[PDB]
Amino acid sequence: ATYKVKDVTTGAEIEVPDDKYILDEFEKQGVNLPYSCRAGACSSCVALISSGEVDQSDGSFLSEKQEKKYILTCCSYPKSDCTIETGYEDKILEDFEIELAETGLEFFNDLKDSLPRSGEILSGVTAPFEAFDHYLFGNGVERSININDVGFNINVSQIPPIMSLLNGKNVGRFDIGSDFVRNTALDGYSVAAYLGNITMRTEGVLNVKSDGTWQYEGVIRSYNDTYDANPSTHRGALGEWSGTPYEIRIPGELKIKENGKK
Ligand code: FES
Ligand SMILES: [Cl-]
């Protein structure tokens, strides 16, 4: 047989026969699709499949659960009419990410009939689903969440302006006041999945002694997150599982106090 496989990404619509790989056939009819290993052992050629099915048993990199929504194009034979989305490597979810997504949606549905779509976002495990629902249905209304409710786990070792002094023959008392970017994946997938990269500010004093002991004390504050979950973002990846961008105000001050030895 020969089933039609459409690609959202390139727009193409190739007739691909059940005995041939999706990548190869696309390449034959002139469509350049991404790849690297060509041996079923990475994710360079991964696509989302949103309808139809395939035989990718020839590949191994994807977990059992990944394979429900993701295919490896360099090892995939269609078994039906397929719509897919190539170029998905940079949006793919890891197993532990998919588990959190699956569980958090289940819990979100448990409160999705009385969502305010304004004010405070509810913290924790439902936040990513709440922030995304607001993206679709909130018509750009500002939202907020206190910096102490987000669930940040921030260490000195993760703050560049502090560490550029701390890794260096620097001794004495240093006042530090600077913006830095926080990739909230450091704080675990449930914060990342709605905050992504966010600009923060730390103000405090670092003491470094000749003996190598140091201590730091100060605070952290956050600028507003710009929430955009369009089709090319990680947040959009969790969504596909149009809107309007919006701000998340993150008021308050987080306190920071640590010490160590070089
Ligand atoms: S290119 Fe490595 S899995 Fe297809
Ligand atoms: Cl600055």
Residue numbers in the entry: 2 to 242, 251 to 271
Question: What do the study's own words say?
Answer:
Pectocin M1 and M2 consist of an M-class cytotoxic domain with lipid II degrading activity, fused to a plant-like ferredoxin domain (Grinter et al., 2012a; 2013,). This ferredoxin domain, which contains an intact [2Fe-2S] iron–sulphur cluster, substitutes for the helical receptor binding domain and IUTD of the M-class bacteriocins discussed above, that are required to deliver the cytotoxic domain to the periplasm. We have previously demonstrated that Pectobacterium spp. are able to acquire iron directly from plant ferredoxin under iron-limiting conditions through a receptor mediated process and that the bacteriocins pectocin M1 and M2 parasitize this system for cell entry through presentation of a ferredoxin domain (Grinter et al., 2013). The lack of an IUTD indicates that the ferredoxin-containing pectocins utilize an existing ferredoxin uptake mechanism to cross the OM, without direct interaction with the Tol or Ton complexes in the periplasm.
In initial crystallization trials for pectocin M2, characteristic red-brown crystals of this ferredoxin-containing bacteriocin formed with PEG 3350 and ammonium sulphate as the precipitants. Data from these crystals were collected to 2.3 Å in the space group P21 and phased using anomalous scattering data from the metal centres of the [2Fe-2S] iron–sulphur cluster. The structure of pectocin M2 revealed an N-terminal domain with the predicted ferredoxin-fold (residues 2–94, in red), separated from the colicin M-like cytotoxic domain (residues 116–271, in blue) by a linker region (residues 95–115, in green) that forms an α-helix. There is a significant difference in the orientation of the cytotoxic and ferredoxin domains of the two pectocin M2 molecules in the asymmetric unit (ASU) with a root mean square deviation (r.m.s.d.) of 3.4 Å, between main-chain atoms. The relative orientation of the ferredoxin domain, linker region and cytotoxic domain gives rise to a non-linear dog-leg structure. Mg2+, Ca2+ or Mn2+ ions are required for catalytic activity of M-class bacteriocins, and analysis of these proteins has shown co-ordination at this position to be essential for activity (Grinter et al., 2012b). In the pectocin M2 structure this key aspartate (D226) adopts an analogous conformation. However, no density for a metal ion is observed in this position, which is occupied by a water molecule. The observation that there is a relatively large difference in orientation between the cytotoxic and ferredoxin domains in the monomers of the ASU is suggestive of such flexibility and indicates that the crystal structure may not be wholly representative of pectocin M2 in solution.
